[PDB]
């Protein structure tokens, strides 16, 4: 499996990723860690699993819900306080590291369905819905206040910056929108390529990155977050996520076992050929530290970063 022919892009000398099969065929959608060893992952069909060895092994945790059809979209821990949101609207909360969980009934006025929750610690969190509504709680989810008043269309692939900014691609990739605290509305931006936008996020140096249709990426101008550099073609395949491990080491995950690494901040790319054996799209890269990282696949497949 995964034999790559001569003439491909240069190969990485080393493979730091190990494939793990979870005790499920459910697709995993998000993961969050309390500390270096204790973490949680969530996915489709209300899948919830816990690790206590840093993600080498995972155990399912039983929940008693009214049904098991929920898609758990996002999980976030800050210390022992953890939150999960999913669709159709559901929110779960823990204050003891996930020993016990409570369902927080969501106000039926909630606009759209939850797509992301961010734990801020000590009773605070913010939640974003697929229509770009943003709500903050400070009292463990009893009350929520809107942080934005207005938006356009359905958002996709929400990403949050270290300072609490958000960027989102529209549901058809025709444009993207940004928001930062104090804005009453998202601000939409026209895309700069013919190719439809698939995903966008933040670099560790205050820029945006974007993945566009046809296996191309680009980075915004440091002088001007609204000017974009030249389109790059890492593989000369569609890409699904991009994530930094360090300021200069970038990983780029795509369909059918495609996984590339750049050690020069995105200038040149090398293929991790070893993971091409694994029969899965790579949907999402999560680095929790320079040493600890996971890639979410299908059918209960994860890749785990081993420090080497």
């Amino acid at each position: 499996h995964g034999l790559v022919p001569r003439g491909s892009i240069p190969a990485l000398d080393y493979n730091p990723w190990e494939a793990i099969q979870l005790p499920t065929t459910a697709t995993i959608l998000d993961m969050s860690f309390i500390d270096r060893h204790h973490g949680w992952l969530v996915g489709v069909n209300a899948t919830l699993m816990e690790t206590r060895d840093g993600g080498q092994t995972w155990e399912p945790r039983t929940l008693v819900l009214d049904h098991s059809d929920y898609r758990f979209n996002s999980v976030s821990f800050q210390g022992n306080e953890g939150w999960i949101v999913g669709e159709p609207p559901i929110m779960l909360h823990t204050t003891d590291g996930g020993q016990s969980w409570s369902q927080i009934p969501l106000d039926p006025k909630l606009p759209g369905s939850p797509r992301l929750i961010k734990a801020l610690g000590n009773g605070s969190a913010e939640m974003i819905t697929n229509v770009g509504a943003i709500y903050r709680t400070k009292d463990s989810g009893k009350n929520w206040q809107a942080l934005v008043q207005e938006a356009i269309g359905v958002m996709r692939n929400l990403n949050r910056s270290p300072s609490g900014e958000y960027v989102a691609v529209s549901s058809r990739g025709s444009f993207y929108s940004t928001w930062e605290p104090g804005q009453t509305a998202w601000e939409p931006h026209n895309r700069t390529t013919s190719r439809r936008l698939h995903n966008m996020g933040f670099t560790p140096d205050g820029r945006l990155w974007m993945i566009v249709n046809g296996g191309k990426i680009a980075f915004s101008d440091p002088d001007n977050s609204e000017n974009w550099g030249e389109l790059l073609s890492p593989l000369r395949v569609g890409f699904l996520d991009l994530a930094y491990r360090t300021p200069n080491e970038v990983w780029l995950a795509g369909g059918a076992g495609a996984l590339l690494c750049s050690q020069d901040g995105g200038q040149t790319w090398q293929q991790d050929v070893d993971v091409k054996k694994v029969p899965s799209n790579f949907y999402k890269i999560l680095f929790f530290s320079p040493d600890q990282g996971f890639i979410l696949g299908q059918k209960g497949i994860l890749l785990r970063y081993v420090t080497d």
Binding site: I104, A133, G153
Partner: peptide
């Protein structure tokens, strides 16, 4: 489609699920 969002939400009391 433009949307205008409720400014405040409130949650009923939580129920244990685990």
């Amino acid at each position: 489609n433009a949307h205008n969002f409720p400014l405040d939400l409130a949650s009923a009391e939580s129920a244990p699920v685990a």
